[PDB]
Every structure is written in C-alpha cells, then in structure tokens.
Amino acid sequence: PSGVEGAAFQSRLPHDRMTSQEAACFPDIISGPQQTQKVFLFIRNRTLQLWLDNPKIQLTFEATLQQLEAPYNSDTVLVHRVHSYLERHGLINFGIYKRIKPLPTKKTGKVIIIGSGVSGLAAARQLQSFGMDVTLLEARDRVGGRVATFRKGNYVADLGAMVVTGLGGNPMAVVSKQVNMELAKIKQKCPLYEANGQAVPKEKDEMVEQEFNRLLEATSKLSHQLDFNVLNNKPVSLGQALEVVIQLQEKHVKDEQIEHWKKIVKTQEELKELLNKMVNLKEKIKELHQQYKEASEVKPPRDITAEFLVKSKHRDLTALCKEYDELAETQGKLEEKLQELEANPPSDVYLSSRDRQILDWHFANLEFANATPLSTLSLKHWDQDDDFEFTGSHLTVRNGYSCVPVALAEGLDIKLNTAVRQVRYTASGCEVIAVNTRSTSQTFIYKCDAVLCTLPLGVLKQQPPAVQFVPPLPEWKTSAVQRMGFGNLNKVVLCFDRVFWDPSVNLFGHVGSTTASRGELFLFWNLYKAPILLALVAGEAAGIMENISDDVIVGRCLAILKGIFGSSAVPQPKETVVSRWRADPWARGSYSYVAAGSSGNDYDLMAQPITPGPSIPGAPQPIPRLFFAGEHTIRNYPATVHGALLSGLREAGRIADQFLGAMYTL
C-alpha cells in the first residue's frame, strides 16, 4: 500500500479502524463520534509515516505538529496524546535513532533485564530511551541470544536466525534502514534431489508438492469443519491428522480399483450367460439342420405334410439362425466393452516409495518451520499466526545477522558471563542473584523495581530449574510453560575454497530414504559471498544428530553433496561448524511452537506480568514486578526475530506505563 495507509500497514495496524490497544488509551475517542475517530486515525497514520519516512532521527512531538496540516494540527492535546502513545509502544522512535532532546539527566526506576537476546535488547533500548536505569544480565559472552553468527576469516554464516521473512509490515525493515545490514533476496527456486544424487523430474516434483498441499488443506478441514480434534482423549497432532488423511486416500485408491474390477466381473458374467445361450443354440441348430436334411431325403413329389416338414424345419432353422446372429452381435458389444475397461484401470497405488520419500521432504520442510516432529504440533492451532505473515521476498543478512543485536547493544549496560540463578520478586521490589559463568564462585546481587525476563522458553522449561523464582511462579503460568512447545533444529556449515554448486540458486533439497531420516541434512543454502554451503537438520533428526560427532555429520553432508555434484568436484571443507541448540544451556532448543494441547492463547499467558502478594498482611495489592518478553511471548509473531523484537517493545512500554505513568490516557 501507498500513502498514510501504507504507513499503517507497515506498522501492522488497520489504517481505517482503531485497535484494541488504542481503545484502551483513547476510550474517549472510540466511544465518541465517527468524525473524531477519523481525525485520530489520520493523526495516528500520518505520524507513523513521518517516522517511517526518516527512521534515523527521533520524531519529536513538536516535529509532528509542525508537519501536520489543518484541520488536524488544530487540536494539540490529541496530537500530543497520539504522539505519546506511539512513542510509548515503539511504533515510532524505536531502534537506533539520533536523539534530538537528550536523555534525561537523572533517571527513574531500575529495571534488570534477564537475557540480552534480541527481545532483551529491544526493551533495554526503549526503557533507557524513556529515562529509566536499565541493566542486562547475559549468561553468554556475547549479545545475540539465538541470533548467532559464525565468523572466521572471510567466512560468515548464522547458526541462528538467518532469514528476514519479508519486509512487508516487518519492524525489521525499520532496523535495516537505521543499521548497516546487507539484505540479500532469496530466489525461490528449490530443486530437490533424491537419495541417488540426481534431480527429481519436473513431472514428479509438481505432482507431489501439489498432493502435499492438498493433504494439508485436508487436515485443516478435519480440524475446523469435521471437528476432528480429540482421539482416545489426547489432542490430535498435525501428524496424526496427516496419517488419517493419507490412510483415507490410500483407502480411496482401493475402492476405485474394487469398483472397476467389479465392473469387469459384471460383464464377464453377462458374457458367460450369453455364451451359454449361444452354445445352446448351436446345439438346437445342429439337431434342426440334421432333421431338415433327413426330411429333404424324401424326394419330391411328396405329400403335403412331408412338404411342410421340409418347409417347417427350414423356417425353424432360419429363425434359430436369426436368434444366434443377434447373439454374436451382442457378444460383439460386450466383448469390446471389456477391452474397454481393461484398458482404463484406475491408478495402481496411492503413492509409491519414490513418491512418499518425496512427500516426506515436504514434511521435513514443515518440521523445520516448526522445529518439531509433526506428531507434537497442534492440529487446530499450529498455523494460528499465518494471518500476520509479512509480504515480500524473504532475505538474508549477508554480513551476518549478529550485526543487528550488536548494533542494538550500543550504549547499554550489559553484564556478560552473568548467569542469573534466582529471581526474587516482592511487594517492595526485586533481587536477582547471578553467578559468574567463568569462576562460578563470584556471586552477584542485583536490586531493582522490576525484572524483565527474556529467558528462552526452553530454559524456563528445564527440569530441574536452571533459574529459581522466589516466590514460585503461579500455577497458571507454569502450566502454560509445560503446554507450550519448544522444539529443535540445527545447522551444519561447510566452508570451501571454491564454488562447486550452482552460484545462481540459493537453496536446494536432499530427499531422505527413510521417513525417520527425513529431517537429516534435508535442505541446503548458498547464501553468503564466501563459498559457504549450509545444511539444515530438522525434524526428529534434529535431536539425534547432536549425539553424533561433527566429523560423522560433515561426513553424511559431504556424502550427499558428492552424489549430487560428483565425487571429484567436492573438495575437503576448509572450516566446519555444527550447531547443537538443544544442548546449549542458554537456549535448550531452537524456538517455540504450538504443541498439541496448546493454543496461541498460551503465548498470551506467557506474556502476562506477575504481581507479588503483599509484604504486610492486609497491605494493598502491589504493582506488578516481573515481566516477560521473547519470541515465546508474542502470539501473533511466534518463533521469529521480528517477534522477539516486537515483544521487547511491548514489555518496555508496559513497564514504563506501570512505573512512569501514562500521561497520554486522560
């Protein structure tokens, strides 16, 4: 879209409707007259535009009013209210802008941020931008969280986030304008190649991909139409639904053969019954023609009864010769209705091995998108965030995605090698105890008004707790923690001294022989300037291949590559790197997913702050103390970077609203 409407769409907001959020801050406007709503909406949509036009400078309130045209520039408190709500919630003045008004001299409140992951950094920057005192505790010796960028010499390859899922509505778009990022488009062509080392033929590849998507659309209708959502009092997974749909197809192939062969027996039996009538007439004809021959033996003249016996047996035989001719006539129609059927058989199988091993690859692709076996995904809800898909080409950050967390970290109080250990949240405030990861022995105490927790969902799931909450988290939160899915997906990175692949195609598939191995090294990426190939390990293979040494894995990797491109064009790799994200103590997995029995409403429970009980009995209900950000908290944008980012912007506004107050709501 274009104009002030495009500003709204690039900020993930309807340009012509007020949101639930703004209903909250502007309940006067919303319950008011249709004209005022339009004014606000223009004022809103206008403002994002000026921010979106130049996102490298702060968009001050005075600036906005200056550039607003009458009649809109007329009501200033409305313009102030809007500009302040926008600034608070990170729709404008977020990321890395030059500040016009300088940061307040003395601050207000103290927030401790667990994790300098992207969601972590996101909040930190907003909070500091709002005049708060912010410190981040990070267990790693670097800032990226699950944005992890390998670098050696000229080689560069993300073991974590790799792909911007298109700038159409993406807050990542604003960051890239502010930040040096080399954004490179990913061209969509993805050749598959079966276990032999030779391409799938275009015929096969379109017939399976189409059947896959057909199977998917089926499951959707089991879910939503037929209401197939419980089976022996467990939830249905996308996996089960997929098998029941394939089993239904595999059944239908067999009714179609059965009904068609049953057509053959219904006519081969009419033939039998007709051949019988035709032998029983050649028999009557045989005996009649005899009788006629004995009756012409009497030689003429003969009396008239003898004359009629010759004449009779003649009619009677010509008549039986008519009846027999009408019957090998009809024997002609049936005998060819039968070379007809036997010529058109229904198809012999539903799917052959070569088909199913190719259909498996599209399941590996789903298991990668969710970082989990389809047997764990929720049927109803796995795709529940599809509505908020961005538009545009997906992209890669060619100088490494880490250049974004790094850029964000500039200006911030960040403590590294600081493993948080216990979070104490009380009516009066918060202490967080951390140890130093190197010399476990050096212990740290951090006191603050509130804690923002961006700990990865897998870390939070750890049994026994890698982090103690004091007091324990309430049952409603810890139940959402189990129900939620945290899955796995790993990456193998191969650096070479020469381009041996097709340099003008960014990706390509490998097809697995087994259903089990369908995840194992099933997808390759040519993405960076250096000669680097990068391979995915998803599905059930994800967790397995962590147990196996790099060398064995780089083995199977170079093996698959040799089959594809020839055992003499594939050199020894110069440097190799295998990820292990479930093993990583600070990750414990790759990203979240809507597990069976979960919903995306668990994402929302995940993001609900915690309010400790009173210190003194009968003292009044406190101010919330413990907040939650990160990809596993943002329902409409799960498991991505831009979602983490968004969640951090979210909490930061919510905290500031609870601790600096919201002048913009009167």
Binding site: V163, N213, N370, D383, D386, D387, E389, L507, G509, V594
Partner: peptide, 16 residues
C-alpha cells in the same frame, strides 16, 4: 510456524 518457511512455502490449509 508456517510463517517461518522460505523454501517451498506450504499452502494447504492457509486462507488466501
């Protein structure tokens, strides 16, 4: 989730 796919984005069950 589905959002996440680059290669051979899956369509069945999505609402165009």
């Amino acid at each position: 989730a589905r959002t996440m796919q680059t290669a051979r984005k899956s369509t069945g069950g999505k609402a165009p």
